[PDB]
Ligand binder design. Structure first.
Ligand code: KVJ
Lengths: 988, 266
């Protein structure tokens, strides 16, 4: 099992400077040895064998070099310590003892599995103990993806391996928006070159065409004679302006201070990676479902126990249901009601569905519920434990025989009696309620029919005719939002015109909802239409991967749309949702997980966040096995980056352990005592080795070199966040950033913050590409574990309340922006403050962000305004107080309006305020035009576990703020009225 | 007949509100509401069929109403009256269902039992205070639920580590017994009795260390035994507060809705 805590010993967060270690010699003798906490295993083994001479049977001991150490780790693993250069305090020992053994077996296989096990947070030897055939078939059959990606990686010279480690950070299109191009002279790049012997850099300025390939850039550099500060490399022939650093330098101004170096300087520093086929790769009369002429029935046998006091609850019963995604294929069927003390039913449940009509993704969703009727006519039902199982296994076999299913706790906030969105399979915690089932037997193994037989029934069932407005109504249906109401008349209309729908491929999601999935006739016909369905935009294919589209060919079409049209920028942009929808997949081996892993193994910047998104949920037992197996396959084939990730992991584990000490053992001690402690362990040797010289998990292109301990401090929160500082070790840290800063917090869930900042960045990309220079600040925020995460620090940023000190006046904020931007820069700081206010005023209203105040709003020196702490979004105040209203979280008080109007009295009547409203209306309608994208992004997070995003009702909040059931003019009227009622007039 | 007096008719109720009224209902459960387009001229019949909520638009042209052309009925009630006694399978197959079970605003108002607006506001302030107190009780109890569940998992892991540790130390005994059996015989004839005492002293040293580790696991096992029982009682109080907290929030939201509907609007 994974590690309980992160201390150096069980129940001990930090070993004393000296500690006694019981040493078990191979001759039976036990030697108590005193060791320094940071002593290496080479030293300990040498001292033990010199001391062993003072004990009986020393003649039996071989040479010291013929042995290694073994002990029990806090993961309860029997780890062999082959890397003897490791310190005693870094072994994560359970108890302070060491066993001396001869090393047997494969040293390379055992060392790699140790590093993979450390990276994923659990020993990979636990995967070996899993008897589940799908788990073992997944570990074996996934190496197909692993073998390929390493081949393509080393296929081409040292260039193909450079495309992996340092991929290009480019936009999805070189087509330059109209307002960004007007910032060019019909591009000045300053290239600094480290010329030996001094390796200093000479400033060389060049005015070159924007569409010039990076090679065309070095051509002008040679005729006239890498991004500075981070590890981003222009190694592909993409137009220079398409690179995300260059594209950012045009809009923001400032000079793209790039750098040129020799290929031999970087290609040689690139180590060669090799995938080694593991030790588990070399190990260990049907009927068609359409031939079974009977209805579906499942026998609920009995359950072991339930936790409910009999004085408060009447009876219990097992509620079941046959589900296809989120919808039931038939009416839910309950068992009879029995006492809580006798959880026995032995009862067949008859479902209203023909067995051949069962779709491929048919699932059984069940739960044990308590029914109590002591008050009024209404009786209250409460789910006690739930469980889902796929009626077909990963080999298309219909489930038969008896089955034991350990159930899951009802997640917090879920009020439905069933949990159809929950994961499938049994709870590995066997100290839970266990329900016994029995599926029917049909004289042989029942398999789902082949795709050749599917097209047979479809060609028999199918065995010009359109009107002008009917084609216009089809277009109107496709344009609706994914959560808009579809009537039964509109379902029959869509299904009647399925073949014309191909002319407009974006209607496919609405068409799939019009299919009777409890009927194989319409389902088989739908298969043939999606096989040759033309591909849709990736943003629309992602909807076909959420919880409402479970069919394999539907999801296979979506993956094939991403395989050809999803750019690496967009895949890296939507990776959060793409990882979350893996939880919806029926099986471990699917086309989506293969596409993500294949992309993660060929692109390291994608593979980086692919690792951390999976690693951050390994604590979650509902997905720990799926994400653990997937992380195992990734760490085997990711090459050298496994070493760098382990540097990141061990750096995080020390921050977690340190913050744990401050929140528990040292919580009631003062700030001064906590800081002297805080610096003390930071000056320890092991801490510096692990906490320095590693890539920032917020951005692997950022190198966190040496720590600046004088700028590190404990923040004044109950969870004690750590404000940390590293120097940028790049040869020109002055060009991009010097002194990198990151906030480490261990205690609060940062997934809502991480999601909101992703949406804020996505909104800004919509505005910029449509000619709106609304500058947000979506800083980095990454969840790395259970309520553990990182936060990027915006340099030279200050809160409004910090400004209102150095009590204050309504003009204090305006005067500060003039004192920090005196002279000509004032007219650009006002523009930045104005364009950043419009972006956050529109974004926070749409998303329903938690209320803003003088500490939630921050302003940079150049005037860029931005918000921090997005702990609540959507209708978070709904369940607390049942008010049905849409809040305006960011109310531009008099302080902000004075700044926008350049200090003009009566700010609601200036030309600057009218242009401020014009951008808000442009921003509001722009996001409303892409409303389907944002609905789908929230829809893909429904199974994550975030509290304010559990049902589609939670997503319905943005359907109100965007007023989707109204016209575009009607919605803009709604936005003006909401801005009017919040600012007490002015918006007309 | 009568218009707008229909118990199954509701004004600006949301589909999310219809879902809560049709959740877990039987086939035939229905209600009519204004169309979500808010055009106020069209309505939407919501029918429960096969575990799903089917939305059936009621088109309106001239003075005729119906589900599809031709529109024949004269009142939206007359359309509901007709199918309340006849099946919808004629209008469309895959229905085979009639508008049998009707959600009624009479039993909807059955919660708010106050007359004067002051009594509803006075009662709303009572249920609100009770709901906040019941919620703070549930949130604190859920925190103990999560912490107890997490600590139980840590104890089970440490108990597994104790099992593996005790195995290794017991392997050390069997290893010492194998290597000693012929070496204590070689010292017996050679009269190195003190060397035998050294071997026996280290064996007592080994058995004493094992006896400590076995007792440390036994103390952690009885700790896990108590905490697993504490979790079971926390789990029961969760399943007792949960259903009462829901209806307490529902009663609260019903009084707040009464106050809005009885107050001035638009
Ligand atoms: C007055 C300070 O006291 C804070 O707590 N500050 C914070 C808090 C947070 C933050 C955000 N979100 C969540 N969830 N938590 C936290 C927290 F845990 F760190 F508090 N972020 C920043 N930023 C990050 C962005 O760049 C600027 C600095 N400053 C400072 C504000 O100036």
């Amino acid at each position: 099992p994974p590690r309980p805590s992160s201390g150096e010993l069980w129940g001990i967060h930090l070993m004393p400077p000296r500690i006694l270690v019981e040493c078990l010699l191979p001759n039976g003798m036990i030697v108590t040895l005193e060791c320094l906490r940071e002593a290496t295993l080479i030293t300990i083994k040498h001292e033990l064998f010199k001391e062993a001479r003072k004990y009986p049977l020393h003649q039996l001991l071989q040479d010291e070099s013929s042995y290694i150490f073994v002990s029990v780790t806090q993961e309860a693993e029997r780890e062999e310590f082959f890397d003897e250069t490791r310190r005693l305090c870094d072994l994560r020992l359970f108890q302070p003892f060491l066993k001396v053994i001869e090393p047997v077996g494969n040293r390379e296989e055992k060392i790699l599995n140790r590093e993979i096990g450390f990276a994923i947070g659990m020993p990979v030897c636990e995967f070996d103990m899993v008897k589940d055939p799908e788990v073992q078939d997944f570990r074996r059959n996934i190496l197909n993806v692993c073998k390929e990606a390493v081949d393509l990686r080393d296929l081409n010279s040292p260039h193909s391996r450079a495309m992996y480690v340092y991929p290009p950070n480019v936009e999805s299109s070189p087509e330059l928006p109209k307002h960004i191009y007007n910032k060019l002279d019909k591009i000045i790049v300053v290239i600094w070159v480290i010329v030996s012997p001094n390796n200093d850099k000479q400033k060389y300025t060049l005015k070159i065409n924007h569409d010039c390939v990076p090679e065309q850039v070095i051509a002008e550099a040679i005729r006239k004679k890498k991004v500075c500060g981070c590890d981003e490399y222009f190694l592909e022939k993409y137009p220079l302006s398409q690179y995300k650093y260059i594209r950012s330098c045009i809009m923001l101004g400032r000079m793209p201070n790039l750098m040129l170096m020799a290929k031999e300087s970087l290609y040689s520093q690139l180590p060669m990676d090799c995938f080694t086929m593991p030790s588990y790769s070399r190990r260990i009369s049907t009927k068609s479902l359409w031939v079974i002429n009977s209805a579906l029935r499942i026998k609920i046998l009995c359950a072991t126990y339930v936790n409910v006091n009999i004085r408060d609850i009447d009876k219990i019963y097992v509620r079941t249901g046959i589900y296809h995604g989120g919808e039931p294929l038939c009416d839910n069927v309950n068992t009879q009601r029995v006492p809580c003390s006798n959880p026995r039913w032995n009862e067949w449940l008859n479902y209203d569905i023909y067995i051949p009509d069962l779709p491929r993704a048919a699932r059984l969703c069940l739960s044990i519920c308590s029914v109590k009727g002591r008050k009024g006519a209404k009786e209250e039902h409460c789910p006690l434990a739930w469980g889902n199982i796929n009626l077909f296994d990963y080999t298309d076999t219909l489930v038969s025989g008896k089955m034991a299913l350990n159930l899951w706790p009802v997640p917090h906030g879920l009020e439905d009696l069933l949990n159809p969105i929950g994961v499938t399979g049994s709870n590995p915690n066997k100290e839970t309620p266990c329900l016994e089932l029995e599926f029917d037997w049909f004289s042989s193994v029942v398999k789902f029919p082949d795709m050749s037989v599917i097209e047979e029934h479809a060609n028999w069932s199918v065995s010009n005719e359109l009107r002008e407005n009917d084609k216009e109504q089809l277009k109107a249906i496709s344009t609706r939002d994914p959560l808009s109401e579809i009537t039964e008349q509109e379902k029959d209309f869509l299904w009647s015109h399925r073949h014309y729908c191909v002319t407009i491929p974006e209607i496919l999601p609405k068409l799939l909802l019009s299919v009777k999935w409890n009927s194989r006739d319409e389902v088989a016909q739908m298969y043939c239409l999606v096989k040759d369905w033309p591909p849709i935009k990736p943003e629309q294919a992602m909807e076909l991967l959420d919880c409402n589209y479970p069919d394999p060919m539907v999801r296979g079409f979506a993956v094939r749309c991403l395989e050809k049209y999803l750019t690496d920028d967009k895949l890296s942009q939507y990776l959060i949702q793409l990882v979350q929808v893996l939880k919806y997949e029926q099986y471990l081996d699917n086309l989506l997980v293969r596409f993500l892993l294949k992309k993660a193994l060929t692109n390291q910047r994608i593979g980086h966040f692919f690792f951390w998104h999976l690693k951050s949920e390994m604590h979650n037992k509902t997905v720990s096995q799926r994400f653990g197996l997937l992380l195992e396959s990734y760490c085997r084939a990711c090459g050298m980056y496994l070493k760098h990730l382990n540097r990141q992991v061990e750096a995080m584990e020390k921050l977690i352990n340190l913050t744990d000490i401050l929140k528990q053992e040292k919580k009631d001690e003062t700030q001064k005592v906590q800081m002297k402690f805080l610096v003390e362990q930071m000056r320890r040797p092991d801490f510096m080795d692990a906490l320095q010289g590693f890539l920032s998990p917020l951005n692997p292109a950022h190198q966190l070199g040496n720590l600046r301990l004088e700028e590190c401090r404990i923040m004044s929160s109950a969870k004690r966040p750590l404000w940390l500082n590293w120097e940028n070790p790049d040869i020109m840290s002055e060009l991009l950033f010097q002194n990198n800063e990151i906030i480490f917090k261990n205690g609060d869930d940062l997934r809502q913050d991480m999601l909101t900042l992703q949406i804020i960045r996505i909104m800004e990309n919509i505005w910029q590409n449509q000619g709106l220079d609304l500058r947000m600040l979506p800083y980095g925020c990454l969840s790395i574990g259970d309520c553990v995460g990182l936060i990027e620090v915006v340099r030279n940023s200050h809160t409004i309340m910090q400004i209102q000190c150095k009590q204050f006046n309504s003009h204090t904020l305006h005067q500060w922006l003039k004192d920090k931007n005196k002279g000509e820069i004032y007219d650009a700081a006002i523009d930045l403050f104005t364009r950043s206010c419009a972006g956050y005023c529109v974004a926070t209203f749409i998303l329903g962000i938690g209320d803003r105040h003088n500490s939630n709003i921050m302003v940079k020196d150049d005037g860029q305004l931005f918000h921090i702490d997005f702990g609540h979004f959507l209708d978070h105040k709904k369940k607390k107080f049942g008010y049905k209203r849409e809040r305006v979280p960011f109310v531009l008080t008099q302080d902000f309006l004075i700044v926008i109007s350049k200090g003009a009295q009566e700010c609601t009547k200036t030309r600057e305020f009218e242009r401020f409203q014009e951008m808000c209306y442009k921003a509001y309608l722009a996001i409303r035009q892409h409303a389907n994208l944002f609905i789908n992004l929230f829809s893909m997070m429904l199974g994550s576990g975030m509290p304010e995003l559990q049902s589609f009702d939670d997503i319905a909040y943005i359907r109100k703020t965007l007023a989707l059931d109204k016209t575009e003019q009607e919605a803009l009227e709604y936005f003006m009225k909401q801005m009017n009622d919040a600012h007490h007039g002015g918006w007309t | 007949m009568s218009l707008q007096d229909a118990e199954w008719y509701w004004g600006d109720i949301s589909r999310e509100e219809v879902n809560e009224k049709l959740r877990d209902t039987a086939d035939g459960t229905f209600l009519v509401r204004d169309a979500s387009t808010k055009m106020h001229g069209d309505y939407t019949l919501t029918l429960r069929k096969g575990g799903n909520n089917k939305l059936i638009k009621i088109f309106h042209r001239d003075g005729k109403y119906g589900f599809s052309d031709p529109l024949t009925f004269s009142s939206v009630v007359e359309l509901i009256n007709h199918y309340r006694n006849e099946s919808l399978a004629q209008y469309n197959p895959k229905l085979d269902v009639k508008l049998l079970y009707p959600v009624s605003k009479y039993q909807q108002d059955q919660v708010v039992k106050e007359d004067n607006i002051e009594a509803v506001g006075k009662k709303l302030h009572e249920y609100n205070t009770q709901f906040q107190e019941k919620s703070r009780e549930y949130d604190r109890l859920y925190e103990e639920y999560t912490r107890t569940s997490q600590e139980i998992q840590m104890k089970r892991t440490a108990i597994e580590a104790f099992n593996e540790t005790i195995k290794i130390f017991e392997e050390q005994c069997q290893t010492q017994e194998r290597y000693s059996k012929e070496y204590i015989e070689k010292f017996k004839r050679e009269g190195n009795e003190k060397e035998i005492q050294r071997i026996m002293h280290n064996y007592d040293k080994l058995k004493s260390r094992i006896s400590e580790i076995i007792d440390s696991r036994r103390r952690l096992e009885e700790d896990l035994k108590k905490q697993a029982a504490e979790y079971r009682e926390i789990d029961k109080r969760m399943n007792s507060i949960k259903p009462d907290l829901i209806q307490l929030r529902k009663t609260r939201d019903q009084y707040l809705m009464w106050l809005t509907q009885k107050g001035v609007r638009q």
